[PDB]
Ligand binder design. Sequence first.
Ligand code: ADP
Ligand code: ADP
Ligand code: ADP
Ligand code: ADP
Ligand code: MG
Ligand code: MG
Ligand code: MG
Ligand code: MG
Ligand code: ZN
Ligand code: ZN
Lengths: 303, 303, 303, 303
Amino acid sequence: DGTKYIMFGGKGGVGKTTMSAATGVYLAEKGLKVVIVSTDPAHSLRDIFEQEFGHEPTKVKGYDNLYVVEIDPQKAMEEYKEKLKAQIEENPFLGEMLEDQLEMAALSPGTDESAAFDVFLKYMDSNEFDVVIFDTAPTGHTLRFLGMPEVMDKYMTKLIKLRKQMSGFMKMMKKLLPFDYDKMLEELEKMKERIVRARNILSDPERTAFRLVVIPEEMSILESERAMKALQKYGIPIDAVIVNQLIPEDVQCDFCRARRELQLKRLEMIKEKFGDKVIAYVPLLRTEAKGIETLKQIAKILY
Amino acid sequence: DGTKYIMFGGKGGVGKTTMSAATGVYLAEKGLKVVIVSTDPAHSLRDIFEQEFGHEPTKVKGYDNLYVVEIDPQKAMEEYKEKLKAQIEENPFLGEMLEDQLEMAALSPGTDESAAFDVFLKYMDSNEFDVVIFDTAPTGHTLRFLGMPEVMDKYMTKLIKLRKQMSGFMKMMKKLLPFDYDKMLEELEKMKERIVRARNILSDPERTAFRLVVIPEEMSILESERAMKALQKYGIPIDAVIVNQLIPEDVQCDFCRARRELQLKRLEMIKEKFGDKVIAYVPLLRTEAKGIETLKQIAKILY
Amino acid sequence: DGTKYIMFGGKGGVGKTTMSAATGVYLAEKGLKVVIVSTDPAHSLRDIFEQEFGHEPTKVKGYDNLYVVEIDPQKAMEEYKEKLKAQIEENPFLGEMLEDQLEMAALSPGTDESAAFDVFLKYMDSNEFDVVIFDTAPTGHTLRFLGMPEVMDKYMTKLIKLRKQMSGFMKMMKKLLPFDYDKMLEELEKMKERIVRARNILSDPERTAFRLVVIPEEMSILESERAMKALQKYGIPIDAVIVNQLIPEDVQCDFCRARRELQLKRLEMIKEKFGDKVIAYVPLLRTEAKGIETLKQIAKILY
Amino acid sequence: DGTKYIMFGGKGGVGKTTMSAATGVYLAEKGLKVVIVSTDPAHSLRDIFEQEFGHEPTKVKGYDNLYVVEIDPQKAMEEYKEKLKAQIEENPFLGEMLEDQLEMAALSPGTDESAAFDVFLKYMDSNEFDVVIFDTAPTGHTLRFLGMPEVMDKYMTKLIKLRKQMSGFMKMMKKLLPFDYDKMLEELEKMKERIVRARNILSDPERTAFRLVVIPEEMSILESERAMKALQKYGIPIDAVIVNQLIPEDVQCDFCRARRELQLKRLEMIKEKFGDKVIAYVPLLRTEAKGIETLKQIAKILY
Ligand SMILES: Nc1ncnc2c1ncn2[C@@H]1O[C@H](COP(=O)(O)OP(=O)(O)O)[C@@H](O)[C@H]1O
Ligand SMILES: Nc1ncnc2c1ncn2[C@@H]1O[C@H](COP(=O)(O)OP(=O)(O)O)[C@@H](O)[C@H]1O
Ligand SMILES: Nc1ncnc2c1ncn2[C@@H]1O[C@H](COP(=O)(O)OP(=O)(O)O)[C@@H](O)[C@H]1O
Ligand SMILES: Nc1ncnc2c1ncn2[C@@H]1O[C@H](COP(=O)(O)OP(=O)(O)O)[C@@H](O)[C@H]1O
Ligand SMILES: [Mg+2]
Ligand SMILES: [Mg+2]
Ligand SMILES: [Mg+2]
Ligand SMILES: [Mg+2]
Ligand SMILES: [Zn+2]
Ligand SMILES: [Zn+2]
């Protein structure tokens, strides 16, 4: 088996980023070559491991086999601006215009999320990593493109018809009046296949493990439940739910007691909705979840 | 004064969505007509107010003046597919092709974030709402487009030169051989102005209040600090920081005591970094922050 | 009445060019401001008047009011290459490319005949000349474009439908994702009108006199007859036929006698086919038809 | 040797069409398979051979090996309109539009001359004919496109540069933003080669004989001299000049004597200017040059 994919998702700020770091560590404990890929422009991972990372995979300190890759459209952008600037030298006018268009792209809202997309696909076709752990929160909408290939197929057929009708007209035009679709079709197909390979790898349990992270709070439970549902529609298996920031059993003050009782209610809720799934529990730490120490500790708690 | 804009941002899951709902309620308490606009595909607000919302503003129950708008590119999409399907009737072939292209857009990653962008601009040019509260997390990168206008200006000038050189050539082509830019420039300018109006309204304190939400945890404090900085570079004023999920003073078990001590450290950190700003504090509730009751309560606590 | 148009056509080498020059002279005899416009790249007129002419109207020597304009796509071309070269200076790369495309146009076969077309239309919309005499041989096919307006009309309507269907689609494209026909329709209409004004002026006897030149030879008679027919289909009136190079009555040698007899047969043919039209006869000169002397003489013979 | 090309040019109405028909006959006399190709929309050849011809080669009556092809853009057009109308059936809207655009082409002035061009090229790449005789008057300007290949080369190189700079940018946009020249270059090259093969065949004496036809009149002599010069600049050899419509030596009336004296002057002129070339003389017939009889007679006179 070439490469295995784990990915963590769930509501905002529940430990997606924390669990993926801890899983990275644990899987690195067994000798395995693991990369964690992060779309946080927040660059959460920096704050966790207490180390700088880049758009090119970096070894986490202490580990030869743990890497983190943080997608930064802007950096790779500027690198490319400097590079293209050399090519354009024959033509400053075209060159400055292309520079401008580039920048304009870079600043437009969609484009940051689609840098992420391109990276995602590059790592879905990749080898050289035993395990790739996607930190970036998938959802029904984030993965909505897996439905793309079918539409792409329809559209491609319409294009094919169109190409045939044009080719008849154009030839006559050239003959009578002196003096494209292949390219468009090629691109469409290339992408269609990339996405199809991806959808097959994610929809296959052997290769990819999707994991949901929740808090004992109605909100996280409900979001992550809906998520489970959309994903269930794509074919993506969810092997596990991880409850996190559980208040531990030894609590005394009226406060902790109260919040813990509420948490137990929500744990009945979780056990109800996701109960058909493996559920792991993680407690709320006295310390913040920060060091590689507390990380190894968390990983141990998960296993 | 026509319309006022409040917007909350800060790390993932710190209470952006919660504070904006509570501010919505409080501002509605004083008779005021307030809309909360949400880019969460999570649809958090549904879970908070315990009510369904749509891409068209909906009254929160019990309130004539409180509305929630949830941007859903997909819904407005399908509405439009059904609509366009009627226009295309003369030409199924072109019609089906346009349908396809549409769907392909919809599924592409960027496009979801730019639906949000379009709505944002529509509400920036809008009246009819006394207060518009943006729930969607702005950051340096989410607002990076406010720098667009200037690049747009450069590019527009290059386009103007180009138009003049083409018109000389084209005229000659037409006479010598039988047998665009105005449109492009018009669009560019239209958008440039929209964004400039927006940048002026957000950079103006009288009109827009930007608010940061943090947890006493090194991570949220650091993110929201960087955010503060990027925003400070656009000219966007940050009038207030709201610390949230503060463990209250009455705590007994060793656990709460420990976490509270840590929080107090981080409160010295917040007081340090944002201290030049107004800081409001909110406690961690025994109950989940859910009902309109606990919402009015939170609002009261904020004021 | 603003401007009057005479035009001569008929087989190759029958005196189109000769009769137009003589008509130019005669009409200039009565004080009248007359321009002869010539598409011969042969530049026949130079050889007739024994003088150089250019793409800008030139006074024939001895006459303030007689001008000749010889359309030379190539000259006006080079003039324009030199001019455009100054505009492109900011961008040599775009500039040299445009230069190349221009030259490529210039050398392509159609383009020489359409330079003629453009001039023709410029003089059809013109004032400042009492009489414009087109030397260039019209025929059914040379004037076939007068039927253009109607097709242009159909096509325009299809374009209008198309524009409406696009505007519905493009409009959503922009909102969903960031970030022509008016121009095409404007051009189409501009030309359609130009051609319609033209067809109305030529189809009008008061304004334009179409004249056919023949030799007493089966060939010229047949060509010019077919010409008469196509033209009759456009609504173009043919006011006169001019038989030319008639062998005079005083002839002696068996040779002249023979050819003259043949000519008289063909004159019965002409009188038969065109008889419903005014027919003028011109004899075959002992001298070549060259000088302004023989020209005034010919004109006198015509009137 | 595959195919040989003869082509006759000279002033309007000097016997281009007559000499080419006579050469056709003579070459067919020796068993040889000869086609005459005519761009006259006049359809002169019909009048000569007294027979109908079409855009597909037709045997001249009495001859298996003598064909005439008359290029008629309009006929081949209508044939094609009827054909395309069947293909478009799935889409009337696109179909009618294409029909319209076609007609518009057909009526446009250039397009008739370029139909001729296309045919010319088809017969330059052709076999199946021992001898192809081009009736259509070449000149410096009619053949001016033979200079096209070099400009085509320059432009192609600019295109190549452009293609490389686009491919860098395009790849980057696809990757950053979800989600032609090959075709243009292919066409350019295809045509460039076609024209180069042509220019090599015409510039080669072994394969192609260019022949100039004149009248003993200053005009024809001057035109055909300039023609000789432009052609000499393309590398096209002119093997022969044919003086035509020479008044014979037996003449009596003062008239014939006069015109003949003038002709002898112009014959000194021809002998002067073209004297370095083979010159054949043809007399002015008592009969019109019409029947296949007088044609065989003329051919005998040429040989
Ligand atoms: N068990 C835990 N005890 C204490 N803090 C935790 C625990 N799990 C997560 N956290 C903290 O919650 C915050 C956000 O979680 P995180 O996974 O980083 O966000 P996201 O899921 O939005 O990337 C971090 O400060 C993290 O250290
Ligand atoms: N003062 C509080 N006490 C208890 N829970 C809170 C408090 N403030 C926020 N929360 C809870 O934190 C979770 C996420 O915060 P939220 O603002 O709702 O998300 P986002 O910030 O991404 O829109 C929710 O489950 C919410 O109820
Ligand atoms: N009456 C005439 N006597 C002798 N030659 C004539 C007469 N009329 C015309 N020609 C000659 O016929 C030849 C070509 O005719 P022309 O009409 O000038 O060419 P085109 O019609 O193609 O421009 C010239 O030599 C011209 O001078
Ligand atoms: N030797 C000749 N004697 C008499 N008439 C001739 C002679 N040669 C050509 N002609 C006549 O000249 C006229 C036109 O010549 P043609 O070659 O058809 O025109 P083009 O050269 O413009 O195609 C015809 O009437 C033709 O019969
Ligand atoms: Mg995260
Ligand atoms: Mg939220
Ligand atoms: Mg002429
Ligand atoms: Mg001819
Ligand atoms: Zn406690
Ligand atoms: Zn005589």
